[PDB]
Amino acid sequence: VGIRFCQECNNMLYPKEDKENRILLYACRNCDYQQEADNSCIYVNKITHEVDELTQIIADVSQDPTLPRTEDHPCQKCGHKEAVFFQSHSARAEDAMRLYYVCTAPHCGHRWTE
């Protein structure tokens, strides 16, 4: 999944298999350093790309004057009544009108979707 950069040359490590030991080794082409791979996964592609946008949402968006705010939905973490609510705001979000609520009030930074 994640890309690992070699210490010796600070370049990308590409997967390689040692036939003798049948052990996956991440080896740079430019330098001879080789590292055993713990993950054992080379390439992962999510065609559905069903990735939650809750992680992508920033807590700073609560300060926006233009965003609508609801006191009807209380915050789960701290119980603050106000919570700005906005849609996906994302391209390639397929067809979702879910409201990604963000708790207002300083430093709570809680994002929940109902």
């Binding site: 298999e17 052990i23 054992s40």
Partner: protein, 192 residues
């Protein structure tokens, strides 16, 4: 802009359609085809659904939830915990193991919603992939009872052996890069 929702289809009408017909353009902006069903298929909605499935292009990418390329030195090792049971069942009476087993593994998960919507079968997909790539691909498919539909693909056992004394050091794409190319080709042009 001012057609109706009754059509339920994109339709070019007005001056642009007149220009398309007058110029006899090779490619219409919205090529369309009206299919009239012969008999009982017209009467029954379910039979019409069957004909629809027959007439609509479907690729592996449409029915594939996600694809992951793993390195598993031993098929019995079953690096993925989930595939342990069915890999063990298949290798209780292993097929094509005598040639060899390719260490690189392509694991494809197929969305059940799309699979049942197009009424595709796991055995059907396996047969189509096997026919498309001949014996160069070996496919393992879960039973439909399994909650997650999993298809496991490995490079040809004969190709892994290379069946050649010289063996050629060309080592084109090794096996991982070749497997990635296979995945892209399968997703784009499976035509299930």
């Amino acid at each position: 802009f001012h057609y109706a929702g009754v059509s339920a289809k994109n339709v070019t009408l007005g001056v642009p359609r007149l220009k398309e017909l007058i110029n006899i353009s090779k490619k219409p902006k919205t090529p369309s085809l009206t299919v009239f069903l012969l008999g009982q298929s017209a009467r029954d909605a379910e039979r019409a659904k069957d004909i629809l499935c027959r007439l609509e292009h479907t690729t592996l990418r449409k029915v594939t939830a996600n694809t992951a390329i793993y390195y598993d030195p031993n098929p019995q090792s079953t690096v993925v915990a989930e595939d342990q049971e069915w890999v063990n069942v298949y290798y209780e009476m292993p097929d094509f193991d005598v040639a060899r087993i390719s260490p690189w593994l392509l694991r494809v998960e197929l969305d059940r919603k799309h699979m049942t919507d197009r009424k595709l079968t796991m055995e059907q997909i396996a047969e189509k992939i096997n026919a498309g790539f001949g014996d160069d691909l070996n496919c393992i498919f879960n039973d439909d009872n399994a909650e997650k539909l999993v298809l496991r693909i490995r490079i040809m056992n004969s190709d892994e052996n290379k069946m050649q004394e010289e063996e050629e050091v060309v080592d084109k794409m090794d096996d991982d890069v070749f497997l990635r190319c296979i995945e892209s080709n399968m997703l784009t042009d499976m035509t299930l």
